[PDB]
Short mmCIF file of C-alpha atoms and ligand atoms in Angstrom, two decimals:
data_model
loop_
_atom_site.label_atom_id
_atom_site.label_comp_id
_atom_site.label_asym_id
_atom_site.label_seq_id
_atom_site.Cartn_x
_atom_site.Cartn_y
_atom_site.Cartn_z
CA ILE A 1 29.02 45.37 -2.66
CA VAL A 2 28.80 44.38 -6.31
CA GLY A 3 25.33 44.89 -7.62
CA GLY A 4 23.43 45.35 -4.38
CA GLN A 5 20.33 47.26 -3.26
CA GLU A 6 20.57 50.27 -0.83
CA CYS A 7 20.19 50.03 2.89
CA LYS A 8 17.32 52.48 3.35
CA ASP A 9 16.56 54.32 6.62
CA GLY A 10 17.03 52.02 9.51
CA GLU A 11 17.24 48.97 7.23
CA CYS A 12 20.73 47.76 8.20
CA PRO A 13 21.21 48.98 11.81
CA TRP A 14 23.89 46.43 12.77
CA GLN A 15 26.41 47.58 10.15
CA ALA A 16 29.58 48.78 11.80
CA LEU A 17 32.42 50.35 9.83
CA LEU A 18 36.04 50.05 10.98
CA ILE A 19 37.89 53.23 10.19
CA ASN A 20 41.68 53.53 10.23
CA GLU A 21 43.72 56.60 11.37
CA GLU A 22 42.85 58.75 8.32
CA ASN A 23 39.13 57.82 8.67
CA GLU A 24 39.42 55.32 5.82
CA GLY A 25 36.91 52.53 6.49
CA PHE A 26 38.98 49.43 5.80
CA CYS A 27 36.46 46.78 6.97
CA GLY A 28 33.04 46.17 8.46
CA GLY A 29 31.61 44.57 11.55
CA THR A 30 28.39 43.46 13.18
CA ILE A 31 27.11 45.12 16.37
CA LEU A 32 26.36 42.38 18.95
CA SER A 33 25.95 44.28 22.23
CA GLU A 34 26.55 47.68 23.87
CA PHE A 35 30.30 46.94 23.87
CA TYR A 36 31.09 44.03 21.55
CA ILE A 37 31.55 44.22 17.79
CA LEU A 38 32.04 41.08 15.70
CA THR A 39 34.48 41.18 12.77
CA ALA A 40 36.92 38.93 10.80
CA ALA A 41 40.44 38.43 12.18
CA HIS A 42 42.54 39.45 9.09
CA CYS A 43 40.98 42.99 9.03
CA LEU A 44 43.00 43.76 12.18
CA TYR A 45 46.12 43.88 9.94
CA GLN A 46 44.87 46.68 7.59
CA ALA A 47 45.66 49.45 10.13
CA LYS A 48 48.09 50.07 13.00
CA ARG A 49 45.12 51.40 14.91
CA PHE A 50 41.48 51.88 14.11
CA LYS A 51 38.16 53.01 15.57
CA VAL A 52 34.63 51.70 15.02
CA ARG A 53 31.90 53.88 13.55
CA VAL A 54 28.28 52.99 13.98
CA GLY A 55 25.19 54.80 12.67
CA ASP A 56 27.03 55.52 9.43
CA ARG A 57 24.91 55.06 6.40
CA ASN A 58 26.75 57.34 3.95
CA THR A 59 30.55 57.78 4.08
CA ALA A 60 30.52 61.31 2.67
CA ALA A 61 28.43 63.65 4.82
CA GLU A 62 28.14 63.94 8.60
CA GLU A 63 24.33 63.87 8.69
CA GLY A 64 24.26 63.15 12.44
CA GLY A 65 23.51 59.60 13.55
CA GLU A 66 27.14 58.57 13.03
CA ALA A 67 29.02 57.83 16.22
CA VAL A 68 32.64 56.75 16.55
CA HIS A 69 33.93 54.62 19.45
CA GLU A 70 37.48 53.61 20.42
CA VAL A 71 38.32 49.93 20.86
CA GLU A 72 39.40 48.82 24.34
CA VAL A 73 40.32 45.20 23.81
CA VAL A 74 40.79 43.26 20.59
CA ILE A 75 40.16 39.53 21.08
CA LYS A 76 41.29 37.67 17.97
CA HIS A 77 40.93 33.96 17.21
CA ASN A 78 44.43 32.72 18.06
CA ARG A 79 44.11 29.95 15.35
CA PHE A 80 43.67 32.30 12.36
CA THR A 81 45.92 30.74 9.81
CA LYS A 82 46.62 33.60 7.37
CA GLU A 83 47.38 31.24 4.43
CA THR A 84 44.04 29.33 4.64
CA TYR A 85 42.04 32.16 6.19
CA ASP A 86 40.66 29.55 8.52
CA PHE A 87 39.22 30.68 11.85
CA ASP A 88 38.82 34.19 10.46
CA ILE A 89 36.93 35.70 13.39
CA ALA A 90 37.62 38.33 16.08
CA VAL A 91 35.68 40.16 18.72
CA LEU A 92 36.33 43.83 19.47
CA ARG A 93 35.33 45.27 22.85
CA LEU A 94 34.69 49.01 22.66
CA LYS A 95 35.68 51.50 25.36
CA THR A 96 32.45 53.46 25.34
CA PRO A 97 29.00 51.87 24.91
CA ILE A 98 27.18 52.18 21.63
CA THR A 99 23.93 54.16 22.04
CA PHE A 100 21.16 52.53 20.03
CA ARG A 101 18.95 54.70 17.84
CA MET A 102 17.50 54.66 14.27
CA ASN A 103 20.14 52.83 12.27
CA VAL A 104 22.02 51.64 15.40
CA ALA A 105 20.99 48.16 16.67
CA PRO A 106 22.62 44.81 17.56
CA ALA A 107 21.98 41.75 15.39
CA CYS A 108 20.83 38.59 17.26
CA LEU A 109 23.14 35.69 17.98
CA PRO A 110 21.48 32.30 17.40
CA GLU A 111 22.42 29.00 19.05
CA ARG A 112 24.50 26.25 17.33
CA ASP A 113 21.46 23.96 17.00
CA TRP A 114 18.90 26.24 15.36
CA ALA A 115 21.34 27.87 13.14
CA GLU A 116 22.52 24.63 11.77
CA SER A 117 19.01 23.77 10.61
CA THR A 118 16.43 26.55 10.22
CA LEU A 119 18.96 29.41 9.49
CA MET A 120 21.29 27.50 7.10
CA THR A 121 18.13 25.74 5.77
CA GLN A 122 16.69 29.08 4.63
CA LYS A 123 17.47 29.58 0.94
CA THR A 124 18.82 33.18 1.35
CA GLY A 125 20.78 35.44 3.68
CA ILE A 126 21.63 39.16 3.63
CA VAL A 127 25.12 40.70 3.43
CA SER A 128 26.18 44.41 3.49
CA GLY A 129 29.15 46.79 3.74
CA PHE A 130 31.09 49.84 2.54
CA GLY A 131 33.24 47.80 0.21
CA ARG A 132 34.10 47.67 -3.51
CA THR A 133 31.24 48.07 -5.79
CA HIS A 134 32.82 46.35 -8.84
CA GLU A 135 36.34 44.86 -8.27
CA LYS A 136 38.82 47.34 -9.75
CA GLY A 137 36.56 50.10 -8.64
CA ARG A 138 35.82 52.52 -5.81
CA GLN A 139 34.62 51.26 -2.44
CA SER A 140 30.94 52.40 -1.85
CA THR A 141 30.06 55.60 0.12
CA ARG A 142 26.39 54.46 0.24
CA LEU A 143 25.73 51.40 2.39
CA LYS A 144 24.77 48.63 0.03
CA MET A 145 23.05 45.40 1.07
CA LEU A 146 22.68 42.26 -1.11
CA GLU A 147 20.61 39.12 -0.94
CA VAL A 148 23.04 36.15 -1.15
CA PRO A 149 21.67 32.58 -1.42
CA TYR A 150 23.09 29.77 0.62
CA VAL A 151 25.32 27.40 -1.41
CA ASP A 152 25.77 23.72 -0.50
CA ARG A 153 29.07 22.55 0.91
CA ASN A 154 30.03 20.23 -1.99
CA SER A 155 29.55 22.75 -4.82
CA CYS A 156 31.39 25.35 -2.69
CA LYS A 157 34.37 22.97 -2.39
CA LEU A 158 34.20 22.08 -6.11
CA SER A 159 34.31 25.75 -7.17
CA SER A 160 36.91 27.27 -4.88
CA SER A 161 40.54 26.79 -5.86
CA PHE A 162 41.40 26.76 -2.12
CA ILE A 163 40.40 24.37 0.64
CA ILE A 164 37.14 25.32 2.30
CA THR A 165 37.11 24.09 5.91
CA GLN A 166 34.08 23.47 8.18
CA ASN A 167 34.64 26.98 9.64
CA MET A 168 33.65 28.51 6.28
CA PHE A 169 30.55 28.44 4.09
CA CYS A 170 29.81 29.63 0.55
CA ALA A 171 27.03 32.07 -0.35
CA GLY A 172 26.77 33.90 -3.64
CA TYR A 173 25.80 33.57 -7.28
CA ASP A 174 27.34 31.19 -9.77
CA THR A 175 26.75 33.35 -12.82
CA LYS A 176 24.69 36.33 -11.66
CA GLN A 177 27.07 39.21 -11.34
CA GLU A 178 26.27 40.21 -7.79
CA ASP A 179 28.36 39.47 -4.63
CA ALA A 180 30.26 40.90 -1.66
CA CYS A 181 33.74 42.20 -2.58
CA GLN A 182 37.05 43.65 -1.21
CA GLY A 183 36.39 45.98 1.75
CA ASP A 184 33.43 44.04 3.13
CA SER A 185 35.69 41.87 5.29
CA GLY A 186 34.22 41.40 8.78
CA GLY A 187 30.81 42.53 7.55
CA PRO A 188 27.55 40.74 8.45
CA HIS A 189 26.00 37.88 6.68
CA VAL A 190 22.78 37.87 8.59
CA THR A 191 19.75 35.57 7.97
CA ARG A 192 16.17 36.68 8.56
CA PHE A 193 13.80 34.38 10.41
CA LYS A 194 10.28 35.67 11.04
CA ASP A 195 11.36 39.34 10.92
CA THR A 196 14.19 38.70 13.51
CA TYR A 197 17.72 38.93 12.06
CA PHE A 198 20.26 36.35 13.20
CA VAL A 199 24.03 36.55 12.47
CA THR A 200 24.99 33.40 10.55
CA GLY A 201 28.36 34.40 9.13
CA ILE A 202 30.94 37.16 8.64
CA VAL A 203 32.45 38.14 5.25
CA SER A 204 35.83 36.47 5.02
CA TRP A 205 37.23 36.17 1.50
CA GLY A 206 36.56 34.97 -2.03
CA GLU A 207 38.09 34.78 -5.49
CA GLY A 208 37.52 38.28 -6.64
CA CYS A 209 33.92 39.47 -6.74
CA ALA A 210 30.78 38.27 -8.59
CA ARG A 211 33.15 36.07 -10.56
CA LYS A 212 31.44 33.81 -13.04
CA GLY A 213 31.90 30.35 -11.63
CA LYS A 214 32.82 31.16 -8.02
CA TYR A 215 30.97 32.12 -4.83
CA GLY A 216 31.66 34.52 -1.95
CA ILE A 217 32.63 32.73 1.20
CA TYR A 218 31.89 33.65 4.81
CA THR A 219 33.13 32.41 8.20
CA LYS A 220 30.44 30.16 9.70
CA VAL A 221 29.37 31.92 12.97
CA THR A 222 27.58 28.70 13.91
CA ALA A 223 31.00 27.13 14.71
CA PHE A 224 32.07 29.96 17.06
CA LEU A 225 29.03 31.12 19.16
CA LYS A 226 30.63 29.55 22.28
CA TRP A 227 33.94 31.33 21.56
CA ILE A 228 31.90 34.50 21.08
CA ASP A 229 30.26 34.24 24.52
CA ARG A 230 33.73 33.40 25.92
CA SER A 231 35.11 36.70 24.69
CA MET A 232 31.86 38.61 25.51
CA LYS A 233 32.34 37.59 29.15
CA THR A 234 36.01 38.18 28.39
CA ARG A 235 38.18 35.20 27.66
CA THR B 42 1.32 12.08 19.01
CA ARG B 43 2.82 15.54 18.73
CA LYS B 44 6.44 16.46 17.90
CA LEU B 45 8.52 18.21 15.23
CA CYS B 46 10.19 21.50 15.49
CA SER B 47 9.96 20.84 11.71
CA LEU B 48 6.15 21.23 11.05
CA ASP B 49 6.37 25.02 11.10
CA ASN B 50 9.14 25.55 13.62
CA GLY B 51 6.62 24.44 16.25
CA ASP B 52 5.26 28.03 16.09
CA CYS B 53 8.23 29.36 18.01
CA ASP B 54 8.96 32.99 17.12
CA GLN B 55 12.64 32.24 17.55
CA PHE B 56 14.47 29.21 19.05
CA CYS B 57 12.60 25.86 18.86
CA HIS B 58 14.13 23.04 20.98
CA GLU B 59 11.96 19.92 21.12
CA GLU B 60 12.14 18.37 24.52
CA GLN B 61 10.65 14.90 25.05
CA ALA B 62 7.56 15.43 22.80
CA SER B 63 6.92 19.11 23.49
CA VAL B 64 8.16 21.84 21.07
CA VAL B 65 9.66 24.21 23.75
CA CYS B 66 10.43 27.68 22.47
CA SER B 67 13.06 30.08 23.74
CA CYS B 68 14.13 33.66 22.94
CA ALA B 69 17.33 35.54 22.18
CA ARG B 70 18.87 37.74 24.90
CA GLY B 71 16.70 40.85 24.90
CA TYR B 72 13.43 38.99 24.41
CA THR B 73 11.16 37.76 27.19
CA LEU B 74 9.14 34.56 26.44
CA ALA B 75 5.44 35.33 26.18
CA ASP B 76 3.16 33.31 28.49
CA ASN B 77 1.91 31.22 25.48
CA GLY B 78 5.34 29.52 25.35
CA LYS B 79 5.62 30.31 21.64
CA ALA B 80 5.99 34.06 21.11
CA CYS B 81 8.98 36.21 22.09
CA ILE B 82 8.29 39.72 23.43
CA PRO B 83 10.97 42.45 23.16
CA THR B 84 12.15 43.41 26.66
CA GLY B 85 14.07 46.54 25.67
CA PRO B 86 13.31 49.47 23.28
CA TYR B 87 15.80 48.30 20.65
CA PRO B 88 15.88 44.47 20.66
CA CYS B 89 18.45 42.69 18.58
CA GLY B 90 17.69 41.78 15.02
CA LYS B 91 14.82 44.19 14.53
CA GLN B 92 15.04 46.86 11.83
CA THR B 93 15.18 50.24 13.57
CA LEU B 94 13.07 52.10 11.06
CA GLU B 95 9.76 53.94 11.21
CA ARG B 96 8.10 50.80 12.27
C1 DX9 C 301 46.70 33.35 0.29
C2 DX9 C 301 45.74 32.18 0.50
N1 DX9 C 301 46.28 30.98 0.59
N2 DX9 C 301 44.41 32.30 0.51
C3 DX9 C 301 43.50 31.21 0.87
C4 DX9 C 301 42.20 31.94 0.62
C5 DX9 C 301 42.36 33.41 0.69
O1 DX9 C 301 41.44 34.16 -0.03
C6 DX9 C 301 41.65 35.52 -0.49
C7 DX9 C 301 42.04 36.52 0.40
C8 DX9 C 301 42.22 37.82 -0.07
C9 DX9 C 301 42.00 38.10 -1.41
C10 DX9 C 301 42.09 39.56 -1.86
C11 DX9 C 301 40.74 39.99 -2.43
C12 DX9 C 301 39.53 39.82 -1.53
C13 DX9 C 301 39.51 40.18 -0.17
C14 DX9 C 301 38.31 40.12 0.56
C15 DX9 C 301 37.15 39.66 -0.07
C16 DX9 C 301 35.94 39.58 0.62
C17 DX9 C 301 34.80 39.09 -0.03
C18 DX9 C 301 34.86 38.63 -1.35
C19 DX9 C 301 33.80 38.00 -1.99
N3 DX9 C 301 33.94 37.60 -3.25
N4 DX9 C 301 32.65 37.80 -1.32
C20 DX9 C 301 36.06 38.80 -2.02
C21 DX9 C 301 37.20 39.25 -1.41
C22 DX9 C 301 38.38 39.32 -2.11
C23 DX9 C 301 43.16 39.98 -2.88
O2 DX9 C 301 43.62 41.11 -2.76
O3 DX9 C 301 43.49 39.20 -3.78
C24 DX9 C 301 41.62 37.09 -2.30
C25 DX9 C 301 41.44 35.79 -1.84
C26 DX9 C 301 43.77 33.56 0.18
CA1 CA C 302 28.27 60.00 6.78
#
Protein backbone atom coordinates (compact mmCIF):
# COMPACT_ATOMS: atom_id res chain seq x y z
CA ILE A 1 0.00 0.00 0.00
CA VAL A 2 1.74 3.23 -0.98
CA GLY A 3 2.29 5.41 2.01
CA GLY A 4 0.04 3.70 4.53
CA GLN A 5 0.01 3.22 8.31
CA GLU A 6 0.54 -0.26 9.92
CA CYS A 7 -2.23 -2.59 10.91
CA LYS A 8 -1.38 -2.99 14.58
CA ASP A 9 -2.45 -5.99 16.72
CA GLY A 10 -5.95 -6.96 15.88
CA GLU A 11 -6.51 -3.76 13.89
CA CYS A 12 -7.33 -5.33 10.50
CA PRO A 13 -8.82 -8.75 11.35
CA TRP A 14 -10.74 -9.21 8.08
CA GLN A 15 -7.65 -9.11 5.85
CA ALA A 16 -7.29 -12.34 3.95
CA LEU A 17 -4.28 -13.08 1.75
CA LEU A 18 -4.55 -15.32 -1.31
CA ILE A 19 -1.39 -17.35 -1.69
CA ASN A 20 -0.45 -19.22 -4.86
CA GLU A 21 1.34 -22.62 -5.06
CA GLU A 22 4.77 -21.27 -3.97
CA ASN A 23 3.13 -19.36 -1.05
CA GLU A 24 3.35 -16.09 -2.99
CA GLY A 25 0.43 -13.91 -1.89
CA PHE A 26 -0.88 -12.62 -5.20
CA CYS A 27 -4.05 -10.87 -3.94
CA GLY A 28 -6.17 -10.07 -0.91
CA GLY A 29 -9.69 -10.74 0.26
CA THR A 30 -12.23 -9.85 2.92
CA ILE A 31 -13.47 -12.45 5.42
CA LEU A 32 -17.31 -12.42 5.39
CA SER A 33 -18.27 -15.61 7.25
CA GLU A 34 -16.86 -18.91 8.55
CA PHE A 35 -16.63 -20.16 4.95
CA TYR A 36 -16.96 -17.26 2.50
CA ILE A 37 -14.19 -14.92 1.42
CA LEU A 38 -14.89 -11.92 -0.81
CA THR A 39 -12.35 -10.99 -3.50
CA ALA A 40 -12.11 -9.43 -7.02
CA ALA A 41 -12.71 -11.69 -10.04
CA HIS A 42 -9.46 -11.00 -12.05
CA CYS A 43 -7.24 -12.23 -9.14
CA LEU A 44 -8.42 -15.77 -9.93
CA TYR A 45 -6.20 -15.64 -13.06
CA GLN A 46 -2.87 -14.97 -11.21
CA ALA A 47 -2.48 -18.65 -10.16
CA LYS A 48 -3.51 -22.09 -11.44
CA ARG A 49 -4.45 -22.86 -7.87
CA PHE A 50 -4.29 -20.95 -4.62
CA LYS A 51 -5.15 -21.13 -0.93
CA VAL A 52 -6.40 -18.46 1.47
CA ARG A 53 -4.41 -17.43 4.51
CA VAL A 54 -6.05 -15.63 7.37
CA GLY A 55 -4.50 -14.34 10.61
CA ASP A 56 -1.42 -13.27 8.67
CA ARG A 57 -0.11 -9.93 9.70
CA ASN A 58 3.53 -10.28 8.60
CA THR A 59 4.50 -12.30 5.50
CA ALA A 60 7.96 -13.24 6.80
CA ALA A 61 7.73 -15.13 10.09
CA GLU A 62 5.31 -17.83 11.24
CA GLU A 63 4.44 -16.17 14.55
CA GLY A 64 1.38 -18.38 15.06
CA GLY A 65 -2.04 -16.87 14.37
CA GLU A 66 -1.68 -17.55 10.64
CA ALA A 67 -4.00 -20.22 9.31
CA VAL A 68 -4.27 -21.46 5.74
CA HIS A 69 -7.48 -22.90 4.26
CA GLU A 70 -8.15 -24.59 0.91
CA VAL A 71 -10.88 -23.24 -1.36
CA GLU A 72 -13.82 -25.56 -2.08
CA VAL A 73 -15.83 -23.59 -4.59
CA VAL A 74 -14.92 -20.46 -6.51
CA ILE A 75 -18.02 -18.46 -7.51
CA LYS A 76 -16.99 -15.74 -9.95
CA HIS A 77 -19.18 -12.98 -11.42
CA ASN A 78 -19.93 -14.45 -14.86
CA ARG A 79 -20.11 -10.86 -16.35
CA PHE A 80 -16.51 -9.85 -15.53
CA THR A 81 -15.44 -8.19 -18.70
CA LYS A 82 -11.62 -8.36 -18.55
CA GLU A 83 -11.15 -5.31 -20.85
CA THR A 84 -13.30 -2.92 -18.73
CA TYR A 85 -12.75 -4.70 -15.42
CA ASP A 86 -16.45 -4.29 -14.89
CA PHE A 87 -18.20 -6.63 -12.45
CA ASP A 88 -14.86 -7.41 -10.84
CA ILE A 89 -16.15 -9.48 -7.93
CA ALA A 90 -15.98 -13.14 -6.83
CA VAL A 91 -16.86 -15.16 -3.79
CA LEU A 92 -14.65 -18.01 -2.59
CA ARG A 93 -16.13 -20.74 -0.40
CA LEU A 94 -13.48 -22.40 1.78
CA LYS A 95 -13.35 -26.11 2.55
CA THR A 96 -12.60 -25.76 6.24
CA PRO A 97 -14.12 -23.05 8.47
CA ILE A 98 -12.04 -20.10 9.53
CA THR A 99 -11.56 -20.05 13.32
CA PHE A 100 -11.90 -16.50 14.63
CA ARG A 101 -9.32 -15.18 17.08
CA MET A 102 -7.22 -11.99 17.60
CA ASN A 103 -6.63 -10.74 14.07
CA VAL A 104 -9.21 -13.12 12.54
CA ALA A 105 -12.75 -11.64 12.16
CA PRO A 106 -15.40 -11.14 9.45
CA ALA A 107 -16.21 -7.63 8.22
CA CYS A 108 -19.94 -6.69 8.21
CA LEU A 109 -22.02 -6.62 5.05
CA PRO A 110 -24.35 -3.60 4.89
CA GLU A 111 -27.62 -3.36 2.95
CA ARG A 112 -27.98 -1.54 -0.43
CA ASP A 113 -29.99 1.30 1.15
CA TRP A 114 -27.77 2.34 4.07
CA ALA A 115 -24.62 1.92 2.20
CA GLU A 116 -25.75 4.16 -0.54
CA SER A 117 -26.27 7.01 1.92
CA THR A 118 -24.55 6.89 5.32
CA LEU A 119 -21.53 4.70 4.22
CA MET A 120 -20.79 6.41 0.86
CA THR A 121 -21.77 9.72 2.58
CA GLN A 122 -18.92 9.32 5.08
CA LYS A 123 -15.91 11.30 3.87
CA THR A 124 -13.37 8.42 4.36
CA GLY A 125 -12.96 4.67 4.11
CA ILE A 126 -10.13 2.26 5.00
CA VAL A 127 -8.21 0.01 2.58
CA SER A 128 -5.42 -2.55 3.31
CA GLY A 129 -3.31 -5.35 1.81
CA PHE A 130 0.04 -7.06 1.22
CA GLY A 131 0.62 -5.23 -2.04
CA ARG A 132 3.22 -2.91 -3.60
CA THR A 133 4.47 -0.26 -1.38
CA HIS A 134 5.64 2.15 -4.14
CA GLU A 135 4.91 1.01 -7.76
CA LYS A 136 8.16 -0.42 -9.14
CA GLY A 137 8.91 -1.73 -5.72
CA ARG A 138 8.55 -4.74 -3.43
CA GLN A 139 5.13 -5.89 -2.26
CA SER A 140 4.81 -5.31 1.58
CA THR A 141 5.55 -8.08 4.16
CA ARG A 142 3.93 -5.91 6.90
CA LEU A 143 0.18 -5.44 6.56
CA LYS A 144 -0.37 -1.82 5.70
CA MET A 145 -3.70 0.00 5.99
CA LEU A 146 -4.51 3.43 4.48
CA GLU A 147 -7.26 5.96 4.94
CA VAL A 148 -8.73 6.68 1.47
CA PRO A 149 -11.35 9.45 1.05
CA TYR A 150 -14.44 8.94 -1.03
CA VAL A 151 -14.29 10.69 -4.43
CA ASP A 152 -17.42 11.89 -6.26
CA ARG A 153 -18.55 10.08 -9.38
CA ASN A 154 -18.03 12.99 -11.83
CA SER A 155 -14.42 13.81 -10.88
CA CYS A 156 -13.66 10.04 -10.91
CA LYS A 157 -14.96 9.83 -14.50
CA LEU A 158 -13.09 13.03 -15.50
CA SER A 159 -9.76 11.70 -14.19
CA SER A 160 -9.72 8.09 -15.33
CA SER A 161 -8.67 7.44 -18.91
CA PHE A 162 -11.06 4.44 -18.92
CA ILE A 163 -14.82 4.25 -18.54
CA ILE A 164 -15.92 3.99 -14.93
CA THR A 165 -19.25 2.14 -14.72
CA GLN A 166 -21.83 2.22 -11.89
CA ASN A 167 -20.23 -1.00 -10.53
CA MET A 168 -17.06 0.97 -9.67
CA PHE A 169 -16.24 3.92 -7.43
CA CYS A 170 -13.15 6.09 -6.98
CA ALA A 171 -11.37 6.60 -3.65
CA GLY A 172 -7.89 8.04 -3.29
CA TYR A 173 -5.85 11.21 -3.32
CA ASP A 174 -5.54 13.61 -6.22
CA THR A 175 -2.05 14.82 -5.37
CA LYS A 176 -1.15 13.28 -2.02
CA GLN A 177 1.15 10.40 -2.77
CA GLU A 178 -0.71 7.69 -0.91
CA ASP A 179 -2.97 4.94 -2.43
CA ALA A 180 -3.59 1.22 -2.85
CA CYS A 181 -1.35 -0.39 -5.51
CA GLN A 182 -0.60 -3.62 -7.49
CA GLY A 183 -1.09 -6.71 -5.28
CA ASP A 184 -3.99 -5.30 -3.27
CA SER A 185 -6.54 -6.63 -5.77
CA GLY A 186 -9.53 -8.18 -3.98
CA GLY A 187 -8.59 -6.43 -0.75
CA PRO A 188 -11.10 -4.63 1.50
CA HIS A 189 -12.23 -1.12 1.23
CA VAL A 190 -14.18 -1.03 4.43
CA THR A 191 -15.99 2.01 5.94
CA ARG A 192 -16.32 2.57 9.68
CA PHE A 193 -19.68 3.58 11.11
CA LYS A 194 -19.89 3.99 14.88
CA ASP A 195 -17.00 1.56 15.53
CA THR A 196 -18.64 -1.17 13.30
CA TYR A 197 -16.79 -1.83 10.02
CA PHE A 198 -18.89 -2.33 6.90
CA VAL A 199 -17.49 -3.60 3.54
CA THR A 200 -18.23 -0.92 0.92
CA GLY A 201 -15.89 -1.97 -1.87
CA ILE A 202 -13.09 -4.28 -3.02
CA VAL A 203 -9.79 -3.11 -4.58
CA SER A 204 -10.15 -3.51 -8.33
CA TRP A 205 -7.69 -1.48 -10.40
CA GLY A 206 -6.27 1.97 -11.05
CA GLU A 207 -3.76 3.85 -13.17
CA GLY A 208 -0.61 2.98 -11.36
CA CYS A 209 -0.43 3.98 -7.72
CA ALA A 210 -0.65 7.33 -5.87
CA ARG A 211 -0.39 8.90 -9.32
CA LYS A 212 -0.65 12.65 -9.32
CA GLY A 213 -3.96 13.36 -10.96
CA LYS A 214 -5.65 9.96 -10.68
CA TYR A 215 -7.50 8.00 -7.99
CA GLY A 216 -7.62 4.34 -6.95
CA ILE A 217 -10.83 2.67 -7.95
CA TYR A 218 -12.78 -0.07 -6.17
CA THR A 219 -15.71 -2.32 -7.11
CA LYS A 220 -18.86 -0.94 -5.44
CA VAL A 221 -20.05 -3.74 -3.07
CA THR A 222 -23.31 -1.84 -2.74
CA ALA A 223 -24.29 -3.05 -6.26
CA PHE A 224 -23.66 -6.75 -5.47
CA LEU A 225 -24.87 -7.53 -1.87
CA LYS A 226 -27.79 -9.57 -3.33
CA TRP A 227 -25.39 -11.51 -5.59
CA ILE A 228 -23.22 -12.02 -2.50
CA ASP A 229 -26.07 -13.58 -0.48
CA ARG A 230 -26.92 -15.64 -3.61
CA SER A 231 -23.48 -17.21 -3.60
CA MET A 232 -23.33 -17.41 0.24
CA LYS A 233 -26.43 -19.62 0.11
CA THR A 234 -24.76 -21.04 -2.99
CA ARG A 235 -25.94 -19.83 -6.35
CA THR B 1 -43.76 15.37 13.94
CA ARG B 2 -40.83 12.98 14.10
CA LYS B 3 -38.89 11.46 11.17
CA LEU B 4 -35.43 11.46 9.57
CA CYS B 5 -32.94 8.72 9.62
CA SER B 6 -30.89 11.85 8.76
CA LEU B 7 -30.93 13.79 12.13
CA ASP B 8 -28.24 11.56 13.62
CA ASN B 9 -29.02 8.26 11.95
CA GLY B 10 -32.08 8.13 14.19
CA ASP B 11 -29.71 6.86 16.93
CA CYS B 12 -29.49 3.46 15.31
CA ASP B 13 -26.17 1.76 16.09
CA GLN B 14 -26.26 0.24 12.62
CA PHE B 15 -29.05 0.05 9.99
CA CYS B 16 -31.67 2.86 10.11
CA HIS B 17 -34.80 2.24 7.96
CA GLU B 18 -37.53 4.84 8.52
CA GLU B 19 -40.89 3.21 8.36
CA GLN B 20 -44.00 5.42 8.24
CA ALA B 21 -42.71 8.08 10.72
CA SER B 22 -40.71 5.84 13.04
CA VAL B 23 -36.89 5.49 12.67
CA VAL B 24 -36.74 1.62 12.95
CA CYS B 25 -33.26 0.27 13.55
CA SER B 26 -31.91 -3.12 12.56
CA CYS B 27 -28.61 -5.01 13.04
CA ALA B 28 -26.13 -6.92 10.92
CA ARG B 29 -26.12 -10.75 11.10
CA GLY B 30 -24.35 -11.50 14.36
CA TYR B 31 -25.98 -8.68 16.30
CA THR B 32 -29.20 -8.97 18.31
CA LEU B 33 -31.35 -5.77 18.51
CA ALA B 34 -31.36 -4.38 22.04
CA ASP B 35 -34.82 -3.88 23.61
CA ASN B 36 -34.50 -0.05 23.17
CA GLY B 37 -34.93 -0.53 19.39
CA LYS B 38 -31.80 1.53 18.75
CA ALA B 39 -28.71 -0.34 19.97
CA CYS B 40 -27.26 -3.54 18.50
CA ILE B 41 -25.82 -6.12 20.92
CA PRO B 42 -23.18 -8.63 19.72
CA THR B 43 -24.64 -12.15 19.82
CA GLY B 44 -21.37 -14.04 19.33
CA PRO B 45 -17.83 -13.63 20.80
CA TYR B 46 -16.38 -12.23 17.57
CA PRO B 47 -19.07 -10.15 15.82
CA CYS B 48 -18.41 -8.84 12.37
CA GLY B 49 -16.79 -5.49 11.91
CA LYS B 50 -15.33 -5.20 15.38
CA GLN B 51 -11.56 -4.87 15.81
CA THR B 52 -10.33 -8.03 17.54
CA LEU B 53 -7.73 -6.35 19.69
CA GLU B 54 -7.19 -6.01 23.43
CA ARG B 55 -10.46 -4.29 23.71
C1 LIG C 1 -6.98 -3.26 -20.16
C2 LIG C 1 -8.14 -2.32 -19.79
N1 LIG C 1 -8.94 -1.97 -20.78
N2 LIG C 1 -8.33 -1.82 -18.58
C3 LIG C 1 -9.52 -1.06 -18.19
C4 LIG C 1 -9.10 -0.72 -16.78
C5 LIG C 1 -8.07 -1.65 -16.26
O1 LIG C 1 -7.23 -1.16 -15.27
C6 LIG C 1 -5.92 -1.67 -14.95
C7 LIG C 1 -5.73 -3.02 -14.67
C8 LIG C 1 -4.47 -3.49 -14.35
C9 LIG C 1 -3.40 -2.60 -14.30
C10 LIG C 1 -2.05 -3.13 -13.83
C11 LIG C 1 -1.63 -2.37 -12.58
C12 LIG C 1 -2.59 -2.38 -11.41
C13 LIG C 1 -3.27 -3.52 -10.95
C14 LIG C 1 -4.04 -3.47 -9.79
C15 LIG C 1 -4.17 -2.26 -9.10
C16 LIG C 1 -4.94 -2.17 -7.94
C17 LIG C 1 -5.07 -0.94 -7.29
C18 LIG C 1 -4.49 0.22 -7.81
C19 LIG C 1 -4.71 1.49 -7.29
N3 LIG C 1 -4.11 2.54 -7.85
N4 LIG C 1 -5.53 1.64 -6.24
C20 LIG C 1 -3.67 0.07 -8.92
C21 LIG C 1 -3.55 -1.11 -9.60
C22 LIG C 1 -2.79 -1.18 -10.74
C23 LIG C 1 -0.85 -3.12 -14.78
O2 LIG C 1 -0.03 -4.03 -14.66
O3 LIG C 1 -0.72 -2.20 -15.59
C24 LIG C 1 -3.59 -1.25 -14.59
C25 LIG C 1 -4.85 -0.78 -14.91
C26 LIG C 1 -7.34 -2.00 -17.53
CA1 LIG D 1 3.79 -14.42 9.01
